[PDB]
mmCIF file with all atom_site columns, C-alpha atoms (C1' of nucleotides) in Angstrom:
data_model
loop_
_atom_site.group_PDB
_atom_site.id
_atom_site.type_symbol
_atom_site.label_atom_id
_atom_site.label_alt_id
_atom_site.label_comp_id
_atom_site.label_asym_id
_atom_site.label_entity_id
_atom_site.label_seq_id
_atom_site.pdbx_PDB_ins_code
_atom_site.Cartn_x
_atom_site.Cartn_y
_atom_site.Cartn_z
_atom_site.occupancy
_atom_site.B_iso_or_equiv
_atom_site.pdbx_formal_charge
_atom_site.auth_seq_id
_atom_site.auth_comp_id
_atom_site.auth_asym_id
_atom_site.auth_atom_id
_atom_site.pdbx_PDB_model_num
ATOM 1   C CA    . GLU A 1 1  ? -116.783 -20.215 190.097 1.00 46.41 ? 1244 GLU A CA    1
ATOM 2   C CA    . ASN A 1 2  ? -113.362 -21.842 189.694 1.00 44.50 ? 1245 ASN A CA    1
ATOM 3   C CA    . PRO A 1 3  ? -113.288 -25.462 188.412 1.00 43.90 ? 1246 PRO A CA    1
ATOM 4   C CA    . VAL A 1 4  ? -110.355 -25.013 186.023 1.00 45.00 ? 1247 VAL A CA    1
ATOM 5   C CA    . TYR A 1 5  ? -107.833 -27.307 187.826 1.00 46.12 ? 1248 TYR A CA    1
ATOM 6   C CA    . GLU A 1 6  ? -104.522 -25.576 187.477 1.00 46.76 ? 1249 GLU A CA    1
ATOM 7   C CA    . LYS A 1 7  ? -101.617 -28.004 187.776 1.00 43.76 ? 1250 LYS A CA    1
ATOM 8   C CA    . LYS A 1 8  ? -98.370  -27.959 189.720 1.00 46.74 ? 1251 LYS A CA    1
ATOM 9   C CA    . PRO A 1 9  ? -95.528  -27.821 187.159 1.00 47.09 ? 1252 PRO A CA    1
ATOM 10  C CA    . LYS A 1 10 ? -94.258  -31.283 188.187 1.00 47.47 ? 1253 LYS A CA    1
ATOM 11  C CA    . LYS A 1 11 ? -90.561  -30.980 187.511 1.00 42.19 ? 1254 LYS A CA    1
ATOM 12  C CA    . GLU A 1 12 ? -88.523  -30.382 190.727 1.00 40.55 ? 1255 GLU A CA    1
ATOM 13  C CA    . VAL A 1 13 ? -86.361  -33.585 190.600 1.00 40.12 ? 1256 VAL A CA    1
ATOM 14  C CA    . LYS A 1 14 ? -84.271  -35.805 188.287 1.00 40.40 ? 1257 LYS A CA    1
ATOM 15  C CA    . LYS A 1 15 ? -83.303  -39.142 189.884 1.00 40.49 ? 1258 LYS A CA    1
ATOM 16  C CA    . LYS A 1 16 ? -83.804  -42.723 188.674 1.00 40.01 ? 1259 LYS A CA    1
ATOM 17  C CA    . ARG A 1 17 ? -83.133  -45.858 190.789 1.00 43.74 ? 1260 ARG A CA    1
ATOM 18  C CA    . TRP A 1 18 ? -85.615  -47.686 193.056 1.00 43.44 ? 1261 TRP A CA    1
ATOM 19  C CA    . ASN A 1 19 ? -86.029  -51.406 192.258 1.00 47.46 ? 1262 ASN A CA    1
ATOM 20  C CA    . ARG A 1 20 ? -84.099  -54.336 190.863 1.00 45.56 ? 1263 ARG A CA    1
ATOM 21  C CA    . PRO A 1 21 ? -83.312  -54.971 187.207 1.00 45.76 ? 1264 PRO A CA    1
ATOM 22  C CA    . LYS A 1 22 ? -83.916  -58.352 185.642 1.00 47.92 ? 1265 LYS A CA    1
ATOM 23  C CA    . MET A 1 23 ? -80.690  -60.358 185.657 1.00 47.93 ? 1266 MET A CA    1
ATOM 24  C CA    . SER A 1 24 ? -79.372  -61.597 182.327 1.00 44.07 ? 1267 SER A CA    1
ATOM 25  C CA    . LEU A 1 25 ? -78.737  -65.068 180.913 1.00 40.32 ? 1268 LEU A CA    1
ATOM 26  C CA    . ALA A 1 26 ? -74.995  -65.259 181.573 1.00 41.24 ? 1269 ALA A CA    1
ATOM 27  C CA    . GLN A 1 27 ? -75.518  -64.020 185.129 1.00 40.23 ? 1270 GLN A CA    1
ATOM 28  C CA    . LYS A 1 28 ? -78.013  -66.725 186.087 1.00 41.63 ? 1271 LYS A CA    1
ATOM 29  C CA    . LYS A 1 29 ? -76.422  -69.508 184.040 1.00 41.45 ? 1272 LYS A CA    1
ATOM 30  C CA    . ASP A 1 30 ? -73.207  -68.847 185.960 1.00 39.12 ? 1273 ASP A CA    1
ATOM 31  C CA    . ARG A 1 31 ? -75.198  -68.735 189.187 1.00 37.61 ? 1274 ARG A CA    1
ATOM 32  C CA    . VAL A 1 32 ? -76.048  -72.397 188.529 1.00 37.59 ? 1275 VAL A CA    1
ATOM 33  C CA    . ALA A 1 33 ? -72.506  -73.787 188.276 1.00 38.20 ? 1276 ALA A CA    1
ATOM 34  C CA    . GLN A 1 34 ? -71.466  -71.573 191.191 1.00 40.18 ? 1277 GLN A CA    1
ATOM 35  C CA    . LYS A 1 35 ? -73.967  -73.597 193.215 1.00 38.54 ? 1278 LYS A CA    1
ATOM 36  C CA    . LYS A 1 36 ? -72.825  -76.818 191.535 1.00 40.01 ? 1279 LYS A CA    1
ATOM 37  C CA    . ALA A 1 37 ? -69.263  -76.060 192.642 1.00 38.86 ? 1280 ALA A CA    1
ATOM 38  C CA    . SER A 1 38 ? -70.278  -75.142 196.195 1.00 38.30 ? 1281 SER A CA    1
ATOM 39  C CA    . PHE A 1 39 ? -72.223  -78.399 196.492 1.00 38.66 ? 1282 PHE A CA    1
ATOM 40  C CA    . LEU A 1 40 ? -69.310  -80.599 195.408 1.00 41.70 ? 1283 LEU A CA    1
ATOM 41  C CA    . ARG A 1 41 ? -66.863  -78.817 197.707 1.00 39.39 ? 1284 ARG A CA    1
ATOM 42  C CA    . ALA A 1 42 ? -68.947  -79.856 200.716 1.00 39.76 ? 1285 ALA A CA    1
ATOM 43  C CA    . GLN A 1 43 ? -69.493  -83.308 199.222 1.00 39.41 ? 1286 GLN A CA    1
ATOM 44  C CA    . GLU A 1 44 ? -65.812  -83.938 198.532 1.00 40.00 ? 1287 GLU A CA    1
ATOM 45  C CA    . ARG A 1 45 ? -63.928  -82.091 201.286 1.00 38.47 ? 1288 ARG A CA    1
ATOM 46  C CA    . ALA A 1 46 ? -66.540  -82.140 204.080 1.00 38.52 ? 1289 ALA A CA    1
ATOM 47  C CA    . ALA A 1 47 ? -66.980  -85.944 203.686 1.00 37.56 ? 1290 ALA A CA    1
ATOM 48  C CA    . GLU A 1 48 ? -63.326  -86.921 203.126 1.00 39.56 ? 1291 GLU A CA    1
ATOM 49  C CA    . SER A 1 49 ? -62.125  -85.140 206.288 1.00 40.03 ? 1292 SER A CA    1
ATOM 50  C "C1'" . C   B 2 1  ? -56.362  -57.358 77.860  1.00 40.54 ? 1085 C   B "C1'" 1
ATOM 51  C "C1'" . C   B 2 2  ? -57.758  -62.033 75.660  1.00 39.72 ? 1086 C   B "C1'" 1
ATOM 52  C "C1'" . C   B 2 3  ? -60.937  -65.463 71.821  1.00 39.18 ? 1087 C   B "C1'" 1
ATOM 53  C "C1'" . U   B 2 4  ? -63.193  -65.171 67.014  1.00 37.53 ? 1088 U   B "C1'" 1
ATOM 54  C "C1'" . G   B 2 5  ? -70.588  -58.895 63.048  1.00 36.03 ? 1089 G   B "C1'" 1
ATOM 55  C "C1'" . G   B 2 6  ? -70.069  -62.227 67.705  1.00 35.47 ? 1090 G   B "C1'" 1
ATOM 56  C "C1'" . G   B 2 7  ? -67.540  -63.815 72.861  1.00 35.61 ? 1091 G   B "C1'" 1
ATOM 57  C "C1'" . G   B 2 8  ? -64.775  -63.436 77.761  1.00 35.17 ? 1092 G   B "C1'" 1
ATOM 58  C "C1'" . G   B 2 9  ? -62.540  -60.384 81.389  1.00 33.38 ? 1093 G   B "C1'" 1
ATOM 59  C "C1'" . G   B 2 10 ? -59.542  -55.831 83.830  1.00 34.33 ? 1094 G   B "C1'" 1
ATOM 60  C "C1'" . G   B 2 11 ? -61.180  -51.462 84.961  1.00 33.87 ? 1095 G   B "C1'" 1
ATOM 61  C "C1'" . C   B 2 12 ? -62.104  -45.535 85.559  1.00 38.03 ? 1096 C   B "C1'" 1
ATOM 62  C "C1'" . C   B 2 13 ? -62.126  -41.466 92.171  1.00 33.69 ? 1097 C   B "C1'" 1
ATOM 63  C "C1'" . G   B 2 14 ? -62.768  -39.535 95.864  1.00 31.33 ? 1098 G   B "C1'" 1
ATOM 64  C "C1'" . G   B 2 15 ? -65.212  -40.287 101.130 1.00 30.93 ? 1099 G   B "C1'" 1
ATOM 65  C "C1'" . G   B 2 16 ? -65.075  -41.991 105.864 1.00 32.27 ? 1100 G   B "C1'" 1
ATOM 66  C "C1'" . C   B 2 17 ? -65.520  -46.295 108.871 1.00 29.98 ? 1101 C   B "C1'" 1
ATOM 67  C "C1'" . C   B 2 18 ? -66.717  -52.298 111.220 1.00 31.87 ? 1102 C   B "C1'" 1
ATOM 68  C "C1'" . A   B 2 19 ? -61.960  -52.171 111.337 1.00 31.94 ? 1103 A   B "C1'" 1
ATOM 69  C "C1'" . C   B 2 20 ? -56.212  -54.137 109.423 1.00 30.73 ? 1104 C   B "C1'" 1
ATOM 70  C "C1'" . C   B 2 21 ? -50.132  -52.863 112.963 1.00 29.27 ? 1105 C   B "C1'" 1
ATOM 71  C "C1'" . C   B 2 22 ? -48.173  -48.402 116.191 1.00 31.49 ? 1106 C   B "C1'" 1
ATOM 72  C "C1'" . C   B 2 23 ? -49.920  -43.846 120.873 1.00 33.67 ? 1107 C   B "C1'" 1
ATOM 73  C "C1'" . U   B 2 24 ? -55.554  -42.263 124.066 1.00 34.40 ? 1108 U   B "C1'" 1
ATOM 74  C "C1'" . C   B 2 25 ? -60.849  -41.503 127.146 1.00 30.91 ? 1109 C   B "C1'" 1
ATOM 75  C "C1'" . C   B 2 26 ? -65.635  -43.351 129.770 1.00 30.40 ? 1110 C   B "C1'" 1
ATOM 76  C "C1'" . C   B 2 27 ? -68.365  -47.455 131.162 1.00 32.17 ? 1111 C   B "C1'" 1
ATOM 77  C "C1'" . A   B 2 28 ? -70.082  -52.939 131.982 1.00 30.69 ? 1112 A   B "C1'" 1
ATOM 78  C "C1'" . C   B 2 29 ? -68.057  -57.446 134.060 1.00 32.86 ? 1113 C   B "C1'" 1
ATOM 79  C "C1'" . G   B 2 30 ? -64.351  -60.502 136.737 1.00 32.87 ? 1114 G   B "C1'" 1
ATOM 80  C "C1'" . G   B 2 31 ? -59.964  -61.151 139.870 1.00 33.63 ? 1115 G   B "C1'" 1
ATOM 81  C "C1'" . C   B 2 32 ? -56.011  -59.402 143.496 1.00 34.78 ? 1116 C   B "C1'" 1
ATOM 82  C "C1'" . G   B 2 33 ? -54.304  -55.553 146.810 1.00 32.73 ? 1117 G   B "C1'" 1
ATOM 83  C "C1'" . C   B 2 34 ? -55.425  -50.688 149.669 1.00 29.23 ? 1118 C   B "C1'" 1
ATOM 84  C "C1'" . G   B 2 35 ? -58.154  -46.674 152.316 1.00 27.89 ? 1119 G   B "C1'" 1
ATOM 85  C "C1'" . A   B 2 36 ? -62.021  -44.982 155.440 1.00 23.60 ? 1120 A   B "C1'" 1
ATOM 86  C "C1'" . C   B 2 37 ? -67.491  -45.517 157.139 1.00 23.19 ? 1121 C   B "C1'" 1
ATOM 87  C "C1'" . C   B 2 38 ? -71.537  -48.801 158.938 1.00 22.52 ? 1122 C   B "C1'" 1
ATOM 88  C "C1'" . G   B 2 39 ? -72.975  -53.522 161.101 1.00 24.52 ? 1123 G   B "C1'" 1
ATOM 89  C "C1'" . C   B 2 40 ? -71.538  -58.192 163.783 1.00 22.06 ? 1124 C   B "C1'" 1
ATOM 90  C "C1'" . U   B 2 41 ? -68.911  -60.713 167.292 1.00 19.85 ? 1125 U   B "C1'" 1
ATOM 91  C "C1'" . C   B 2 42 ? -65.254  -63.406 169.355 1.00 17.37 ? 1126 C   B "C1'" 1
ATOM 92  C "C1'" . U   B 2 43 ? -60.678  -66.444 166.927 1.00 17.68 ? 1127 U   B "C1'" 1
ATOM 93  C "C1'" . C   B 2 44 ? -55.086  -65.671 166.373 1.00 19.32 ? 1128 C   B "C1'" 1
ATOM 94  C "C1'" . C   B 2 45 ? -53.946  -64.271 171.694 1.00 19.21 ? 1129 C   B "C1'" 1
ATOM 95  C "C1'" . C   B 2 46 ? -52.475  -64.451 176.903 1.00 21.89 ? 1130 C   B "C1'" 1
ATOM 96  C "C1'" . A   B 2 47 ? -51.718  -65.010 182.671 1.00 22.80 ? 1131 A   B "C1'" 1
ATOM 97  C "C1'" . G   B 2 48 ? -51.119  -79.563 176.464 1.00 21.82 ? 1132 G   B "C1'" 1
ATOM 98  C "C1'" . G   B 2 49 ? -54.851  -78.118 180.095 1.00 21.22 ? 1133 G   B "C1'" 1
ATOM 99  C "C1'" . G   B 2 50 ? -56.613  -73.607 180.953 1.00 17.03 ? 1134 G   B "C1'" 1
ATOM 100 C "C1'" . G   B 2 51 ? -58.006  -68.483 180.788 1.00 19.17 ? 1135 G   B "C1'" 1
ATOM 101 C "C1'" . G   B 2 52 ? -61.044  -63.351 177.533 1.00 19.79 ? 1136 G   B "C1'" 1
ATOM 102 C "C1'" . C   B 2 53 ? -61.225  -58.961 173.894 1.00 18.36 ? 1137 C   B "C1'" 1
ATOM 103 C "C1'" . G   B 2 54 ? -58.443  -56.953 177.510 1.00 15.44 ? 1138 G   B "C1'" 1
ATOM 104 C "C1'" . G   B 2 55 ? -56.813  -52.935 180.779 1.00 16.77 ? 1139 G   B "C1'" 1
ATOM 105 C "C1'" . G   B 2 56 ? -58.180  -48.653 183.552 1.00 15.97 ? 1140 G   B "C1'" 1
ATOM 106 C "C1'" . G   B 2 57 ? -61.809  -45.221 185.391 1.00 13.41 ? 1141 G   B "C1'" 1
ATOM 107 C "C1'" . C   B 2 58 ? -66.938  -42.922 186.984 1.00 14.42 ? 1142 C   B "C1'" 1
ATOM 108 C "C1'" . G   B 2 59 ? -69.205  -46.619 188.537 1.00 14.62 ? 1143 G   B "C1'" 1
ATOM 109 C "C1'" . G   B 2 60 ? -73.540  -49.278 189.763 1.00 12.64 ? 1144 G   B "C1'" 1
ATOM 110 C "C1'" . A   B 2 61 ? -76.164  -53.608 190.668 1.00 17.13 ? 1145 A   B "C1'" 1
ATOM 111 C "C1'" . C   B 2 62 ? -75.690  -58.833 191.620 1.00 15.36 ? 1146 C   B "C1'" 1
ATOM 112 C "C1'" . U   B 2 63 ? -74.199  -63.893 192.783 1.00 14.68 ? 1147 U   B "C1'" 1
ATOM 113 C "C1'" . G   B 2 64 ? -71.952  -68.582 196.769 1.00 14.26 ? 1148 G   B "C1'" 1
ATOM 114 C "C1'" . U   B 2 65 ? -75.785  -76.720 201.099 1.00 15.88 ? 1149 U   B "C1'" 1
ATOM 115 C "C1'" . C   B 2 66 ? -71.722  -69.947 202.340 1.00 19.41 ? 1150 C   B "C1'" 1
ATOM 116 C "C1'" . C   B 2 67 ? -63.246  -72.147 199.010 1.00 20.54 ? 1151 C   B "C1'" 1
ATOM 117 C "C1'" . C   B 2 68 ? -65.013  -64.467 202.089 1.00 22.63 ? 1152 C   B "C1'" 1
ATOM 118 C "C1'" . C   B 2 69 ? -62.873  -64.896 199.018 1.00 25.70 ? 1153 C   B "C1'" 1
ATOM 119 C "C1'" . A   B 2 70 ? -64.201  -65.760 194.292 1.00 23.73 ? 1154 A   B "C1'" 1
ATOM 120 C "C1'" . G   B 2 71 ? -67.518  -64.898 190.176 1.00 19.08 ? 1155 G   B "C1'" 1
ATOM 121 C "C1'" . U   B 2 72 ? -71.183  -62.431 186.456 1.00 20.50 ? 1156 U   B "C1'" 1
ATOM 122 C "C1'" . G   B 2 73 ? -73.802  -58.829 183.630 1.00 19.64 ? 1157 G   B "C1'" 1
ATOM 123 C "C1'" . C   B 2 74 ? -74.933  -53.637 182.193 1.00 21.21 ? 1158 C   B "C1'" 1
ATOM 124 C "C1'" . G   B 2 75 ? -74.100  -47.916 181.299 1.00 20.61 ? 1159 G   B "C1'" 1
ATOM 125 C "C1'" . C   B 2 76 ? -70.143  -44.569 179.876 1.00 18.21 ? 1160 C   B "C1'" 1
ATOM 126 C "C1'" . C   B 2 77 ? -64.633  -43.217 178.186 1.00 18.67 ? 1161 C   B "C1'" 1
ATOM 127 C "C1'" . C   B 2 78 ? -60.295  -44.823 175.607 1.00 18.81 ? 1162 C   B "C1'" 1
ATOM 128 C "C1'" . C   B 2 79 ? -56.865  -48.546 172.621 1.00 20.56 ? 1163 C   B "C1'" 1
ATOM 129 C "C1'" . G   B 2 80 ? -56.689  -54.018 170.525 1.00 21.96 ? 1164 G   B "C1'" 1
#
RNA sequence: CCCUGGGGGGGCCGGGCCACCCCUCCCACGGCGCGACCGCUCUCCCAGGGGGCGGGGCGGACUGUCCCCAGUGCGCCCCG
């Protein structure tokens, strides 16, 4: 006698941040040389000392 | 008008214009300079190399055989 499926009006909130964004080209290309610098600082200094 | 019934020329007067020299419109094309809009990006620049669009904000996320201090995007707002 009542199958109509009324719906809750869904609104109630407006917020938007839960997971990571995909990092860009210049952010990961500069992640590479930041590791290439950190490697050669422990190859030069930490083996000359 | 000219030469011997014949011959050779000049013509008759107004109208505008392609135009002929002097002043004026709209287009087509080409060049230089200027204005503002849209779109693109970083050079002159700046603290020989080097460091960029900066600078600031609301920020917000991220990076480092770990110089924990340094570095990189993106949203917005404003000038170059």
